[PDB]
């Protein structure tokens, strides 16, 4: 027969052990829930036991049976005869942890079987659904099945274990021969020194006024990460088509003037550089670009999961920019929409253990101040962005506002918020001809 | 008996249509493979046809039957009787691509059902696998379905294809640079240089404060497009009646003062000019005006489709303006209504392969800023307009705010967002007497 996977012996043993030894409730409470039991009487008994245990009362046989009787639910369980049978038949000398794990396991397998049956039934009767709708349904069902089990490993850990992990981290910091970079290499020496790269499981915000080079700087970071690493780099772009992204990348890598590329007025050396760049890019082949418009966090997460499944992991994720993303269920309030976007991005970064760099904009009123360098308060309408981001970097070019500027070709990266380090300004050289940022070679005070 | 999903008639239609018309083969080949066919004979027939098409031979009835008879496989298919049945039932009025898509869809449904059955059967028989192993197996099986599929026009593409597309676009632009007279002509030299005309499948927004000349500029663009093309030009004027629009058009084309036409104070030469203009317009007959108010996006799409069907295409669509359009299901929230309107307009523009220009208004706060030249943020409540538009132009006249302006008679079109080109300011001459914009003949900086 198509038997529903279950094991009554493990449940009966668990209940008998709990009746005999009231001190083991915790060892059972962290391995199984009431809904994890297969039969209605067992679930009912476990629920009553949880109520008694959290009300401060003993869970012996007579009190439990009497309490079930008082609520009129004693007959549904099976009676004082069945409760006494449970107490007696199961031996005291038992390993209840294995039984709790067994009860936990059958519930997951049974739910998997249930979802498979639901998928097949939905497949037989689509009811106007396309293949994409069916795939979305299947992915949603399996995700609900699998995700959130990880809360077992998340919680109050032992002091010794955390201390040993900290010692391992510090000794790995000491033993590594790198030049101050522990995460993904940003490609700039001073920024690498100040940030130790882009740390995995961190939310990174890149902010600037319009036309400051935000996309250019982000693409430079992407190119440097691709060149200096082996893991794939994924880009979500609601701002520009993929063709313009590739043209900018060619200009940046080949050091060829972007105006010439746009107008086609290239020369022999530029063609040679572009050929070399194309050869290198086709040799590496680790950059993926998605220029779809109107992205939602669910779509971004689904596509990132698909990429990670295809290639066994991600090294960095870049999104440009989050002011274009949509959350249809929260379209009424933009602040809630931004908060949901930020929370989902932070959760994704934590889950996949990758650095996520999301670009963002600032308010226009910043341009009306005496000093236009951004501050945290300049992130109005986006308080949750400031609250959730691990790192926040602002791009500032003085020549954008002043033609008289002595800092032509010089850009400032201002660290508005750093979770694990100092804050300040790092100067870089801006070559708008090649759409590139480079290390600042001038004197440093 | 649960019949799993199949349709013999669609398969028979595909095979028959390929038998009757061999030039459609490619369309079928890009939409279906031999494994998408439910019956063994249909798979065998498609395989034999694919081999014959690869060898260069025709795949008509007689050739296919002769090739099958040579290999001795004619009996497996069903015989010349079945081949003749396929030849007879399928008409020559075949849209084989739709049937091929249907075959593809059935295959996906079948694979999903089979995978669900496999997962459930694995659930009933763990064979020593742990819960994590079963969940990983289920996730891998379900995820493998979406591998490849149709993720070319509906997802991230291959980097090499995008690079080749960029190279081809650069070749097309550099080979024949005509300075903006390749797409829809705008009638202005500088605007053609900066925008390369009004590109088909692009959404164009024109915005300004009231009385700046938005309607005048839009009508000038419409007139230029109509005079410099042959395809119909359609106008959706929710702001003015068609009579006033036609009076302005007569004033512009005949270069007669608009106030004289409005008040009727015209002399003989003006009457001759107006008669000549009317004669030219009635000779051309390619301008259509709809002055209904409160139009929904569905009605706009329906009428645009009807015009394109009736007259074999469109060259430009103009809407004035989108603050008067209505979406009754979203009347409570203005932002959602504007987002829906912009999305529908973009979809229509992409579907009909025509430039769609939509006019919009700006908030009063612009008049309080130190610099009154419009910016994107002056499109308050219409972020979706900025997100979805391919081109965004703002109209600014300095003489409106300053009577002692040195730029009297000079208007600025500011490109706030261009998706496929640069941004900047284009100066034009404003002749309010004739309700006209003209090329700026003054010095250019």
């Amino acid at each position: 027969l198509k038997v529903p996977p279950h094991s009554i012996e493990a449940e009966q043993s668990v209940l008998g052990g709990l009746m005999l030894d009231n001190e083991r409730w915790d060892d059972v409470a962290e391995r199984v829930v009431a809904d994890d039991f297969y039969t209605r009487p067992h679930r009912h008994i476990f629920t009553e036991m949880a109520r008694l245990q959290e009300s401060g009362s003993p869970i012996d046989l007579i009190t439990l049976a009497e309490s079930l009787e008082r609520q009129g639910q004693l007959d549904s369980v099976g009676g004082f005869a069945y409760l006494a049978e449970l107490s007696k038949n199961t031996p005291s000398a038992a390993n209840i942890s294995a039984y709790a794990d067994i009860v936990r396991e059958r519930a997951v397998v049974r739910e998997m079987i249930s979802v498979a049956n639901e998928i097949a039934e939905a497949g037989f009767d689509p009811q106007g659904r396309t293949s994409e709708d069916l795939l979305d349904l299947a992915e949603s069902r399996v995700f609900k099945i699998a995700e959130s089990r990880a809360n077992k490993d998340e919680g109050p850990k032992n002091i010794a274990d955390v201390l040993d992990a900290t010692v391992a981290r510090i000794e790995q910091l000491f033993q590594q021969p790198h030049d101050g970079v522990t995460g993904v290499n940003t490609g700039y020496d001073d920024l690498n020194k100040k940030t130790a790269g882009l740390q995995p499981s961190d939310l990174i915000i890149v902010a600037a006024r319009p036309s400051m080079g935000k996309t250019t700087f982000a693409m430079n970071l992407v190119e440097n990460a691709a060149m200096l690493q082996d893991k794939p780099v994924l880009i979500f772009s609601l701002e520009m088509p993929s063709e313009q992204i590739m043209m900018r990348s060619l200009a940046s890598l080949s050091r060829v003037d972007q105006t010439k590329i746009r107008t086609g007025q290239l020369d022999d050396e530029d063609w040679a550089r572009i050929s070399g760049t194309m050869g290198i890019l086709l040799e590496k082949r680790n950059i993926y670009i998605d220029d779809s418009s109107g992205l939602t966090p669910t779509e971004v997460r689904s596509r990132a999961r698909r990429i990670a499944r295809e290639h066994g992991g991600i090294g960095l994720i870049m999104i440009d920019y989050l002011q274009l993303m949509r959350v249809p269920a929260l379209s009424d309030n933009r602040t809630l929409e931004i908060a949901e976007i930020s929370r989902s991005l932070k959760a994704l970064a934590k889950e996949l253990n990758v650095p996520v760099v999301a670009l963002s904009q600032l308010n226009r009123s910043l341009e009306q101040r005496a000093d236009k360098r951004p501050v945290n308060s300049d992130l109005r309408e986006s308080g949750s962005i400031e609250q959730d981001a691990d790192l926040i970097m602002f791009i500032y070019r003085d020549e954008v506002y002043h033609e008289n500027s002595d800092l032509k070709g010089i850009a400032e990266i201002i660290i508005g918020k750093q979770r694990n380090g100092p804050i300040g300004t790092v100067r870089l050289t801006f070559n708008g001809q090649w759409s590139r940022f480079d290390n600042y070679a001038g004197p440093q005070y | 008996l649960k019949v799993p999903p199949h349709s013999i008639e669609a398969e028979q239609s595909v095979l028959g249509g390929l038998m009757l018309d061999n030039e459609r083969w490619d369309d079928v080949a890009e939409r279906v493979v031999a494994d998408d066919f439910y019956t063994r004979p249909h798979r065998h027939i498609f395989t034999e046809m694919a081999r014959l098409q690869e060898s260069g031979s025709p795949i008509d009835l007689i050739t296919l039957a002769e090739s099958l008879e040579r290999q001795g496989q004619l009996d497996s298919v069903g015989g010349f009787a079945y081949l003749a049945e396929l030849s007879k039932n399928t008409p020559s009025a075949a849209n084989i691509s739709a049937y091929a898509d249907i075959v593809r869809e059935r295959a996906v449904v079948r694979e999903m059902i089979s995978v669900a059955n496999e997962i459930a059967e694995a659930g009933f028989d763990p064979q020593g696998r742990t819960s994590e192993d079963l969940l990983d197996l289920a996730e891998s099986r379900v995820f493998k379905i979406a591998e490849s599929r149709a993720n070319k026009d509906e997802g991230p593409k291959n980097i090499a294809d995008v690079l080749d597309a960029t190279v081809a676009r650069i070749e097309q632009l550099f080979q024949q640079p005509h300075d903006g007279v390749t797409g829809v002509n705008t009638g202005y030299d500088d605007l053609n240089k900066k925008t390369a005309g009004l590109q088909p499948s692009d959404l164009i927004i024109v915005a300004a404060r009231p009385s700046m000349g938005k309607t005048t500029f839009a009508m000038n663009l419409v007139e230029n497009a109509a005079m410099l093309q042959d395809k119909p030009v359609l106008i959706f004027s929710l702001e003015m009646p068609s009579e006033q629009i036609m009076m302005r058009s007569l004033a512009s084309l005949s270069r007669v003062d608009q106030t004289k036409i409005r008040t009727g104070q015209l002399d003989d030469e003006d009457w001759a000019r107006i008669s000549g203009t009317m004669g030219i317009l009635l000779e051309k007959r390619n301008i259509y005006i709809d002055d209904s108010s409160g139009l929904t996006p569905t009605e706009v799409r329906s009428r645009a489709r009807r015009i394109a069907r009736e007259h074999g295409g469109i060259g430009l669509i103009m809407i004035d303006y989108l603050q008067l359009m209505r979406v009754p299901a979203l009347s409570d929230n203005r932002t959602l209504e504007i987002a829906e309107i912009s999305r529908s307009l973009k979809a229509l523009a992409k579907e009909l392969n025509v430039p769609v220009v939509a006019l919009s208004q700006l908030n009063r706060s612009l008049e309080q800023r130190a610099d009154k030249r419009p910016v994107n943020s002056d499109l308050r409540e219409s972020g979706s307009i900025e997100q979805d538009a391919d081109l965004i132009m703002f109209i600014y006249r300095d003489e409106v705010y300053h009577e002692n302006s040195d730029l009297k008679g000079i208007a600025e079109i500011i490109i706030g967002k261009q998706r496929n080109g640069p941004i900047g300011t284009v100066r034009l001459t404003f002749n309010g007497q004739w309700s006209r914009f003209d090329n700026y003949a003054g010095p250019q900086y």
Partner: peptide, 23 residues
């Protein structure tokens, strides 16, 4: 480079890098 020279260079690049699916 002119039109013909640019076309020849691009064709050489495509031949060196393959990508026969562009055509």
């Amino acid at each position: 480079l002119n039109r013909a020279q640019a076309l020849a260079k691009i064709a050489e690049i495509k031949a060196k890098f393959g990508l026969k699916g562009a055509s």
